[PDB]
Design a protein around this nucleic acid. Sequence first.
RNA 1: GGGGAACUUGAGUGCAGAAGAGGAGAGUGGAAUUCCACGUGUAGCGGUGAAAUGCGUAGAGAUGUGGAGGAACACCAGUGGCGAAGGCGACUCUCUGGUCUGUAACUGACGCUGAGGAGCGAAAGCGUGGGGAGCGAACAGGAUUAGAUACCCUGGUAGUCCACGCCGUAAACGAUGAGUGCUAAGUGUUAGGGGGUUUCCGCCCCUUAGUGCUGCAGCUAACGCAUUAAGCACUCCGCCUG
Lengths: 85, 64, 114, 92, 272
Amino acid sequence: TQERKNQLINEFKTHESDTGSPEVQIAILTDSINNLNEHLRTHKKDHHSRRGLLKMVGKRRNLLTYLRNKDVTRYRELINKLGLR
Amino acid sequence: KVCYFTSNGITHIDYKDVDLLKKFVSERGKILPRRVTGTNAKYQRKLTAAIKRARQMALLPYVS
Amino acid sequence: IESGIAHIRSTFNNTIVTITDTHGNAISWSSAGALGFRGSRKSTPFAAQMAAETAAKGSIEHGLKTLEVTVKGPGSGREAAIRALQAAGLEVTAIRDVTPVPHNGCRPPKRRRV
Amino acid sequence: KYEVMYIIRPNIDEESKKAVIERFNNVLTSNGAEITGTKDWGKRRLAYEINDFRDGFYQIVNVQSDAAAVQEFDRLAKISDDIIRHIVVKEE
Amino acid sequence: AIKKYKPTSNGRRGMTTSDFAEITTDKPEKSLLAPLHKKGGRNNQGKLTVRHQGGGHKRQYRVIDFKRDKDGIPGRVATVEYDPNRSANIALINYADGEKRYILAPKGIQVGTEIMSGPEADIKVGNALPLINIPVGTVVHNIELKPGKGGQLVRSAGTSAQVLGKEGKYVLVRLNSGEVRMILSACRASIGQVGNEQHELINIGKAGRSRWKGIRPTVRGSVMNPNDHPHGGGEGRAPIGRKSPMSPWGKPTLGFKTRKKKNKSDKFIVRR
RNA sequence: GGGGAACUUGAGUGCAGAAGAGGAGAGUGGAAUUCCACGUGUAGCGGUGAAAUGCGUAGAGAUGUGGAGGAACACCAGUGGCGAAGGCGACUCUCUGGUCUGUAACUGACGCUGAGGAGCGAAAGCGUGGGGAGCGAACAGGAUUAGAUACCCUGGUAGUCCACGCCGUAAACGAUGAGUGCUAAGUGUUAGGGGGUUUCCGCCCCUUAGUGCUGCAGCUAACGCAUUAAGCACUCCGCCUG
């Protein structure tokens, strides 16, 4: 618990102590997405967690759009490695 | 008005301590209300949690 | 047969009286209907009071002195019969207000005005 | 970080006591858990009857595990004919 | 594991079948097969004594181990197989020593799990114990009456029984249909639920499929003639004017018990 | 409006705590109601404004045991808490959602709203398979009535429960859309944070976020709302025109 978070932020670290930098954030958002997805498969009917999932994926979406508008190079270099379309 | 837990400055229940739970349940086994125990609102819910746990564990009767 | 337990139901329509042994063994019983009250009069405190001393009379000839009473349900017979016992010369050592009070139990019947 | 309480019915020969508690601790340690401390109470008049016993034996097993051993413990405890009650708490 | 055929022809208009994901193989182990020729309701002298039977698809018997006698040897189960004798499905489990055996596959069994059968076996799905070791309030299947005879009582798909308490030489166990029974405490049953629970929901669409299964057509008593059934005869479609409805051989056939009332086993049935 | 370079209050991330009937799954337990067998036990029990149908000598009800089951979790419990809404109260565990506080380490406008669309959406209801204690539409019997297809009484099927699908409605109400900023106070209460006397208790002062109650200006046709606006304003959606 919280160790994968440290792993992800430390390995996507762009600036020496960055924890904003939405390219870092979207990593944690994706981790929460797929983790909660494996949780949903074992509990189909947890609709409140489904609502949380919808909120968080929407957050990830507009973060991605902002990064796209900010710079296409960083976007592409992130999406290709994270494998999401 | 007197608040026993914050007066004697003790933290969470540590449910094993069955001595004061008698003082906080009636002789009938009914859990006493705030109006008589005078304890703090935040602590009362963890109280009834502790009494319920020990009650399930048969340290306090359901009815006396 | 020296000690026993007298149980009385205090309902809104009737009042039963029954005596038993510490082993939970009945000896005798009485009721408003047993005495001859048929209508709503069975609910009166007087009917339960009468019930008390007939139960006492059915008790003495078997030789029991000391009692302690359990009362069930709410009704007007709560106060009548208990002191009717000691009016009948007996000695009741304790009063027990045991009534079935379920935590949730079963859903009660519908309302009386629908 | 689990603090387990359980009761063993009074009519156990002191020979078989040590057997039953020892095999339970064996189950805990073998399922990945580690005992952070063991502790006992002994006799106490039960607050109410459970099956036919007026009293019982009270034992405490303060353990720190990965939360998988205690489910097997719960199965073994409920399925043993001699233990009466038991619960597990996640101490914070 | 239930699928619907979209209605293409008219025969498949109402149809359901069970896809066989629970099954793990198609070819059985040659050693345990035994011959079986279908009798078709004919007695030893050749006369017909069981109507409505005969003419199915030919099937080969797989000898199941209902006894679970071999105790203490850790059993590994790696298969779940189809068997056209009984609704349930079976598992070929291979033991440590090296001989294989078939067992009624219980619900929640998967390839690779372990098996034990001693009188001290842990209580899981697939283990077998004498009832004395079984604890109260635990579902169980494949019970028998005379110890060592082998399970008889709960064997069909999705069938289960519950133990309501041990009281001495015998035990109280709730069979299917709820008619609780007194049973010897020295008998060995198989813990769990029979693992083809969805078998009831099949909707056999075609008459031809019931005939494949081997069920001959059944003709109503009413459309018979007077001499060949107590209902037959009468002009037009007649109601049965014979007070109680009756069977082809004379007895009434609605709502009356039939077990010879003096039999010994009755004293154990009547626990109820 | 477009493009480029800033910046951090808006919006997020990290860090330390806090609370909760928030949700899903498994198991566990206490008092009862009913039924059953058993002991004792005589004459009624039950019921309403009177009564009656019912149950009882085939031994009732009552009362002492032991089982069997299914439903809900008493006091704690509070105009308390959580949730976007429906709603969510016994206990434990497994998984999991959101919120608030203090920070100032991070990104630097990434924000608001949102037709269509998607998902949730009480109770009744429907389909399949179980389950069925109590309650109880329908239905029967007894009362009342001129009549009573009801109000009352005794029963009681479907439902009420569980697993998976379907319907998509409610006075689904605060009869008040969402977001942002400003505009007198007093007073409770919930979860915090800081400080003054002690790092004792508990006394007080600030301070956020909720959740009530009175009450200015202001609005209101009247009621009344009044920092939880129905006030002063700006964006976006929905809706109305006897």
